[PDB]
Nucleic acid binder design. Structure first.
Lengths: 48, 150, 932, 95, 122, 100, 79, 108
RNA sequence: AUGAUGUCAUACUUAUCCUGUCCCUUUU
RNA sequence: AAGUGUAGUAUCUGUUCUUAUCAGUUUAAUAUCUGAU
């Protein structure tokens, strides 16, 4: 999957800002849409 | 009344071997196969062999006076519908050193020709695998033929 | 092979008649020339241009390739044996799921990635059928909604032209056919008049759905055909089904017959009466009369009791058919008469009288299957006759039946079984003569190890045995059937057990002798010992046998107990499952016979085997424990409640279906009956465990959970239960989420609602929309469950409902309307007029709304207010809206007026105000002004 | 329309209108059909039939123009027969 | 109805195979004590010896009898054959029942009742 | 119904027959679709029960066990005196469930 | 008879079959006629209402019954 | 001795717009006589075509052999022709002439 | 500074719903 | 770091009408839509 929605992108940006970049599971535990691998992939791809 | 016969009828045989629109007799045995011999027919009816025949590819062989029944017609007015048809089959032949093997060869069998057949001044009879070898001058009809092959 | 004719179906009154004539005059000379002496027949330029659609051009490129392919016939024989970038195009548009290769030919137009070109625009917009058939569920729902909304826009012509080939897909799976049928139904629900020209085109694809093995699919096909017929006119449908009568394909004839039957069921018997009468009087061909008889039979079978008034008229259609020369027409007419009879309750015997004499006369000259058809017709007609003639009729038919008892024909066997079931049930049947004549052959010739294997044969034999036992007696049938109790055949054993069970249930086993009783006990034991297929036949049979034996089963009690113990020690799922089933079934007999030691031993074995991991065995053990608690008392049960309650507490998380159901039932019974051995902390823990049981995928589980929560509330107290329920964060809004509100209402009905009201009012102060909607739904359910008890809480529930009436959210307004409906239904006559008016003050603006749920709730609340607040106030509030100018306002007001006028038809006289009299109208009811 | 006047098929014969209707159907429908003839005959079976349903059936079987022709040919002939004291039109006496 | 007899026989065999029918109850307890198999639905142009040779592939036939008409020509489709052993009859009912030959396929059943000339059905 | 708005009630004339509901739908109100407070018994149509149509479930459509009754909310609202409430239609429910 | 008006039913719509159910395009004459007919039927129904209505005139109960049954056809007027 | 799905007509897609049609006829003739060859002259038809041989056996043999055969730069997909489903544009008129000719020729 | 539009995500309600069958198609 | 399906509703993101008029359909009226300058 991984549609890379807008609200998901904002949530990932907020997680990287507050939770951190080296905590993919902490962000995946508040998304419930993609895996931590996919989350870090979207962070390094578009949400960097 | 009922006319009881208790004899063999033709309906079972017709259903066993029926062509596209006709009956199909002279059913080859199940011991045959497709050969791979380096031999091809070179029919030159008047010392001019324009076409070429390599029967190792085809298993069904029909040259007769049936345009709709057989595979194709033939310009052989002295030929019947089903009189003689040679067929390649894996016959258990003894090699030169005695090593027996199922070698592919053409079986010599007469299909009940109306006027028989002849090849090099000799007619071939059924129920006996004649010495079928290469470089043979034959005919593809019942009465006679003025054409041969190699 | 019979269904393969459906693959030979091509798409698309005088021209059709000439085409059928040409078809007949082409199907005649083929066998004509065949006697005088295919799909690959010759093709013509007209045939070639007609086969394929537009978008192609014949072009033999050189003048040598045509005479290169012309001798290809001879080139297949002589020269055949002789000497001898990275491009691709799938179908994605934005997602466009994978199209199968068979569907590639259908959706090929979408494979082209061209865009921005009108007619082609609509054709491409019609590519949503690809996403509907092949795609995810959300895409399917979206395509369904788009087709529902874009009906008139896309046009019915292109829709049918695109849907018909998809229905004819040779690779069309069951799900694809179901989706296509649903789409066709949705399209026919909107388009009404435009479906006329495509009537035949849609019927050609929809008829095979009727002739199918799937019962649900056949029902869907019948419903679709009925809707299609009701859409267009009966005359158009008759014109479409006209040429199918004389169709060569018999499958086409059966399809046309089913279609005519559906059209008669929809548009009515008499609407299709004269068409059928003209079809029956057709001297053109015997196939016509055969199709007519088949249509009559199918119409009767589908209509059932609807043929009562037109039956005599049906006789007028069928009277000239009995004299048919061809045996097929006579057989069809006999089947039709039998259908009209057996489908018809006793009535209209005179209407069939014209067919009475010849059929029996045909029994005299009966030979072959015609005798069977005549016997079936006579059997169907015998009960419709009176006793005087029925005596002679049965006395004459019984001899022919006995003569035909040795018929190898399975159809003759079924006909004889039906005739026995019909005739033996007559009052003029000799019991001793029946037992002398029909009983031994029915046991020998009818009862056989091969007959039971069939599906219809099994039910037929069961019905025949039941009727014979009810007619002649139970002891003879029992003696005939008990010998087969040890039958090696499982199906024959099940049939014998079902026959014995039906006999014992209908006649009663009091006639069972001592030797017969012992034989039946041995048979039941052998059957329970040999049960390969998991079926309730053996269990239900043992239960009925025990219930019939009563106290006479005490000698068989210990043998059954030993067998149950050995089976519990035997294979769990195979043996112990049936063992626990038999125990739970015979608990009543064991308690009735005073099996005290037996009950205690059973309880001990159940407490021992309760720790089994197999859910099938554990659930049956829990059910047997529940039955023992139902028979054995609480204090008298040897496995006391102190061990049962905490042991059954953690079993709620078993996650099995039957296990969860049995555990919920046992806990609920224990907490509703005893309610003492459970401690306060134990009750709290049980409630905390049952809170998790609401997430199941069943409804009965939720109902049992609500009942158990109510019992626990009645036992422990309201405070703790309401506190545990108030914590429902409602993660999901479905999966029994409102179930917490239902449990709150159950606790309020069991406990003092004075305690449950203000706690709920305080929990409603939370911010979450989920919690607010839950509080509203719980208040509505509580008011509905209380009813008369709400005479005091009306003034207390008024302001919260008035505040929630503010439409901040649609769900809030829906819950408000539902609470208003429940309150109006419950406050009937209790004197809550002020609260009703205060609620109506905020409920009236909710009339203007488009939500289906909100609209339904508003309508229900208006009905409840008219019931309680009265129709006078309802009309006073709906008066100005009647003659309003708008379309939507007038529509809503007219719906409200129709709702208020459906009931209260008598009280609308007074509420009707005095409207002044116009020039050409005197509307003022002057009689009402008559002052006495 | 001419089929708007109330008629009564009980006060007229049927054999006199059978071959005329048959010829009209063979001319309009072209081919020879038994379903249409029997349907038209059974349509006039009731004692107080209705011309609207007959016209609808004729439009379903015929094209719609030939249906109008058949309706306008059957209505006035039947009306004249019902008006005749003997119960038949002027054509039944001509030949 | 006429052709559905072979369908019923095949369905009974398939149900016995699927229901877990044992060898003792494999649609043979009723046809026991007699190997007279009744074949029906055969074509009107079938010969006696041809049918004998066809049904002889499953064993030796003891006594065959075709439906001989009064003056029609012995063309009715019915036939009764008591084979050598009942095992051959079971094998024929298992393999030859519903076989297609000479166009229209015929049906086979186990009667084991008596020598009835007029017992089959068209 | 509230669960199935696309259903078509029979609305036929009332007879002298007593109906029953499927075990899966035991206790469910025929009209009100509630689960408590029943008032009156459910009457079946004359044509709604004739042979194979006899003994079927009113709402569930399956084989009935228990005798059903109308909900008191439907009885007080003058709703129980309506036509035959037999579910003649079967659509938008249990259609593709067999496929799963 | 070229009319083309086959008003039977289209897709099994609401289709109020009750007598006086009411609709959207109901003209004033229709509502007035329905109300007058319902009031006449109610006056024919209630026994005490019939006694109170007929007690005004010297006519008998049957007189009021006939006068009410006669006023059912076209009470308001030809629309 | 073949499935009913096999038919004399075969749809060949995934071809160029200017495809060498003589070579196409030669490739189709490897099976049997090309009874007809229709080349899509439309835009959406540009790159697709249909063929029809006078025999079903040869057509099936070529379908087995020419399944996704190689081309200059692509591989056209060859599938069995689906049902017609569109014949109202055509009509069975003028067939009475053929019927009368058949009745006069044989005389029956 | 309310709105119309509609691919594509999201919350909600209907006490929505998982053993449902060919017990009925036996047409040639 | 788990839910299945059946119907419907809303709030989010992206786009569009300074076209002057006439006639009609439709609308409570606008609007939208359909033809001409």
């Amino acid at each position: 999957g991984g549609v890379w929605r807008n609200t998901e992108d904002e949530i990932l940006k907020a997680a990287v800002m507050k939770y951190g970049k080296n905590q993919w599971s902490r962000i995946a535990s508040l998304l419930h849409r993609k895996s931590a691998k996919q989350c870090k992939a979207r962070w390094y791809e578009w949400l960097d | 009344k009922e006319k009881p016969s208790f004899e063999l009828s033709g309906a079972l045989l017709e259903d066993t071997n029926t062509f596209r629109g006709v009956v199909i007799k002279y059913s080859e045995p199940p011991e045959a196969r497709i050969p791979k011999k380096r031999w091809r027919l070179y029919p030159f009816k008047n010392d001019e062999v324009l076409p070429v025949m390599y029967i190792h590819r085809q298993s069904a062989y029909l040259l007769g006076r049936h345009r709709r029944i057989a595979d194709i017609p033939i310009d052989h007015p002295s030929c019947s519908k089903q009189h003689a048809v040679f067929q390649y089959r894996l016959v258990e032949y003894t090699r030169a050193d005695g090593t027996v093997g199922r070698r592919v060869k053409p079986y010599i069998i007469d299909l009940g020709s109306g006027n028989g057949t002849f090849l090099n001044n000799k007619r071939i009879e059924p129920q006996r695998y004649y010495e079928l070898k290469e470089k043979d001058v034959l005919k593809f009809g019942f009465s006679s033929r003025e054409y041969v092959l190699l | 092979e019979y269904k393969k004719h459906r693959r030979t179906m091509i798409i698309s009154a005088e021209t059709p008649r000439t085409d059928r004539g040409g078809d007949s005059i082409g199907e005649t000379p083929t066998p004509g020339a065949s006697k005088r002496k295919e799909r690959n027949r010759p093709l013509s330029d007209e045939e070639l241009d007609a086969m394929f659609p537009e978008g192609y051009k014949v072009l033999p490129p050189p003048a040598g390739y045509v005479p290169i392919r012309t001798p290809a016939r001879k080139l297949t024989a002589t020269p055949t044996p002789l000497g001898g970038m990275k491009s691709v195009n799938d179908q994605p548009s934005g997602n466009l799921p994978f199209l199968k290769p068979d569907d590639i030919q259908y959706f090929d137009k979408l494979l082209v990635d061209v865009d921005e070109s009108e007619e082609q625009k609509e054709r491409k917009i019609m590519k949503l059928l690809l996403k509907i058939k092949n795609g995810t569920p959300p895409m399917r729902k979206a395509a369904l909604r788009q087709i529902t909304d874009k009906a008139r826009e896309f046009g019915a012509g292109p829709l049918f032209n695109q849907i018909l080939p998809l229905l004819m897909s040779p690779t069309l799976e069951d799900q694809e056919r179901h989706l296509l049928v649903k789409v066709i139904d949705r399209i026919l629900y909107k388009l009404d008049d435009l479906v006329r020209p495509y009537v035949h085109k849609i019927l050609v694809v929809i008829e095979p759905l009727l002739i199918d093995e799937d019962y649900y699919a056949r029902v869907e096909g019948r419903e679709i055909i009925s809707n299609l017929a009701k859409a267009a006119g009966l005359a158009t449908m008759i014109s479409t089904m006209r040429p199918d009568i004389d169709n060569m394909d018999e499958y086409v004839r059966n399809t046309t017959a089913r279609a005519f039957a559906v059209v008669a069921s929809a548009l009515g018997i008499p609407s299709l009466l004269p068409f059928l009468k003209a079809v029956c009087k057709s001297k053109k061909s015997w196939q016509a009369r055969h199709t007519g008889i088949k249509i009559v039979q199918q119409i009767a079978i589908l209509m059932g009791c609807a043929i009562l008034p037109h039956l005599r008229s049906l006789v007028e259609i069928i009277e000239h058919g009995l004299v048919d020369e061809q045996q097929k027409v006579r057989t069809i007419s006999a089947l039709a008469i039998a259908a009209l009879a057996e489908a018809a309750t006793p009535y209209g015997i005179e209407s069939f009288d014209s067919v009475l004499k010849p059929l029996w006369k045909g029994i005299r000259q009966h030979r072959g299957k015609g005798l069977a058809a005549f016997l079936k017709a006579i059997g169907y007609l015998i009960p419709l006759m009176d006793a005087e003639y029925a005596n002679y009729y049965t006395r004459e038919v019984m001899l022919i039946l006995i003569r035909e008892f040795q018929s190898p024909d399975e159809e003759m066997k079924k006909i004889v079984l039906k005739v026995v079931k019909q005739c033996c049930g007559t009052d003029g049947v000799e019991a001793n003569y029946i037992k002398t004549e029909i009983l031994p052959p029915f046991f020998k010739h009818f009862w056989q190890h091969r007959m039971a294997l069939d599906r219809r044969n099994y039910r037929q034999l069961v019905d025949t045995t039941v009727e014979l036992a009810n007619k002649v007696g139970a002891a003879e049938i029992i003696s005939r059937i008990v010998d087969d109790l040890k039958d090696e055949a499982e199906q024959y054993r099940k049939m014998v057990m079902e026959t014995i069970e039906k006999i014992m249930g209908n006649l009663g086993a009091a006639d069972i002798d001592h030797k017969l009783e012992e034989q039946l006990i041995d048979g039941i034991l052998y059957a329970f010992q040999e049960q390969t297929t998991e079926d309730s036949v053996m269990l239900n049979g043992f239960g009925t046998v025990v219930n019939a034996l009563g106290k006479r089963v005490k000698p068989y009690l210990p043998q059954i107990c030993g067998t149950v113990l050995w089976r519990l020690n035997n294979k769990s799922a195979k043996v112990r499952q049936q063992a626990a089933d038999l125990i739970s079934r015979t608990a009543v007999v064991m308690k009735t016979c005073q099996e005290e030691k037996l009950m205690g031993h059973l309880g001990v074995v159940l407490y021992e085997y309760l720790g089994e991991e197999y859910p099938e065995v554990l659930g049956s053990i829990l059910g047997a424990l529940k039955a023992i608690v139902n028979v054995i008392g609480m204090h008298k049960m040897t496995p006391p409640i102190k061990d049962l309650l905490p042991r059954l507490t953690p079993i709620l998380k078993n996650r099995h279906e039957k296990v969860q159901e049995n555990c919920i039932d046992l806990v609920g019974r224990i907490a509703d009956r005893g309610a003492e051995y459970v401690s306060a902390r134990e009750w709290m823990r049980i409630c905390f465990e049952l809170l998790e049981l609401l997430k199941a995928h069943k409804k009965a589980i939720r109902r049992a959970t609500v009942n158990t929560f109510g019992y626990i509330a009645k036992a422990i107290g309201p405070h703790d239960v309401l506190a545990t329920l108030l914590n429902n964060l409602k993660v999901q809004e479905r999966q029994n989420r409102v179930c917490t509100t239902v449990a709150i209402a159950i606790v309020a009905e069991t406990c003092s609602p004075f305690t449950v009201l203000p706690a709920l009012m305080n929990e409603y102060r939370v911010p979450e929309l989920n919690v607010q909607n839950g509080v509203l739904k719980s208040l509505s359910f509580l008011f509905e469950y209380i009813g008369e008890m709400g005479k005091d809480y009306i003034y207390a529930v008024t302001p919260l409902l008035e505040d929630a009436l503010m439409d901040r959210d649609l769900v809030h307004r829906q819950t408000a309307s539902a609470v208003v409906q429940h309150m109006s239904l419950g406050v009937y006559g209790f004197g809550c007029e002020d609260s009703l008016n205060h609620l109506l003050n905020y409920v009236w603006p909710n009339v203007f709304e488009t939500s289906p749920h909100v609209i339904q709730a508003v309508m229900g609340a208006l009905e409840g207010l008219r019931v309680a607040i009265g129709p006078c106030r309802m009309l006073q509030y709906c008066l100005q809206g009647l003659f309003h100018p708008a379309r939507k306002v007038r529509d809503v007001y007219w719906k409200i007026y129709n709702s208020i006028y459906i009931g209260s038809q008598d009280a609308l006289i007074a509420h009707y105000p005095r409207i002044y009299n116009d020039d050409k109208n005197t509307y003022i009811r002057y009689e009402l002004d008559y002052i006495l | 329309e001419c089929l708007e006047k109330k008629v009564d098929m009980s006060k007229v014969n049927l054999e006199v209108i059978k071959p005329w209707i048959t010829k009209r159907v063979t001319e309009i429908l072209g081919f020879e059909d038994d379903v249409v003839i029997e349907f038209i005959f059974n349509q006039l079976e009731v004692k107080n039939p209705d011309s609207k349903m007959m016209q609808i059936n004729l439009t379903g079987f015929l094209n719609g123009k030939n249906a109008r022709e058949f309706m306008g040919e059957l209505w006035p002939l039947l009306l004249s027969a019902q008006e005749n004291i003997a119960g038949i039109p002027s054509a039944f006496l001509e030949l | 109805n006429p052709l559905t007899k072979v369908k019923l026989i095949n369905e009974l065999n398939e149900r016995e195979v699927q229901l877990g029918v044992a060898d003792k109850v494999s649609w043979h307890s009723e046809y026991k004590d007699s190997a007279w198999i009744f074949l029906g639905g055969l074509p009107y142009e079938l010969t006696e010896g041809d049918i004998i040779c066809v049904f002889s592939q499953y064993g030796e036939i003891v006594n065959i009898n075709l439906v001989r008409d009064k003056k029609t020509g012995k063309s009715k489709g019915f036939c009764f054959l008591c084979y050598e052993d009942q095992r051959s009859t079971i094998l024929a009912v298992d393999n030859f029942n519903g076989i297609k030959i000479k166009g229209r396929t015929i049906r086979v059943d186990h009667v084991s009742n008596y020598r009835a000339p007029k017992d089959s059905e068209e | 119904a509230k669960h199935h708005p696309d259903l078509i009630f029979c609305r036929k004339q009332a007879g002298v027959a007593i109906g029953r509901l499927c075990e899966k739908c035991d206790g469910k109100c025929v009209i009100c679709d509630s689960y408590v407070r029943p008032c009156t018994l459910v009457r079946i149509c004359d044509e709604c029960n004739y042979g194979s149509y006899q003994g079927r479930c009113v709402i569930c459509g399956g084989p009935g066990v228990s005798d059903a009754y109308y909900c008191k909310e439907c009885t007080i609202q003058e709703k129980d005196r309506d036509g035959c409430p037999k579910i003649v239609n079967l659509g938008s429910s249990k259609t593709d469930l067999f496929y799963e | 008879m070229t009319d083309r008006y086959t008003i039977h039913s289209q897709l099994e719509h609401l289709q109020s079959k009750y007598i006086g159910t009411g609709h959207a395009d109901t003209t004033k004459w229709e509502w007035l006629v329905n109300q007058h007919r319902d009031s006449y039927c109610s006056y024919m129904g209630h026994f005490d209402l019939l006694n109170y209505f007929a007690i005004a005139e010297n006519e008998s109960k049957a007189r009021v019954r006939f006068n009410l049954m006669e006023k059912m056809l076209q009470p308001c007027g030809p629309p | 001795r073949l499935p009913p799905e096999v038919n004399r007509i075969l749809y060949i897609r995934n071809l160029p717009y200017k495809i060498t049609a003589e070579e196409m006829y030669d490739i189709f003739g490897k099976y049997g006589p090309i009874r007809q060859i229709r080349v899509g002259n439309t835009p959406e038809t540009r790159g697709t075509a249909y063929v029809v041989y006078e025999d079903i056996f040869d057509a099936k043999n070529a379908c087995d052999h020419l399944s996704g055969f190689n081309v200059c730069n692509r591989y056209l997909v060859v599938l069995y022709y689906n049902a017609n489903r569109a014949f109202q544009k055509m009509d069975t008129k003028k067939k009475e002439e053929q019927l009368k000719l058949l009745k006069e020729k044989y005389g029956i």
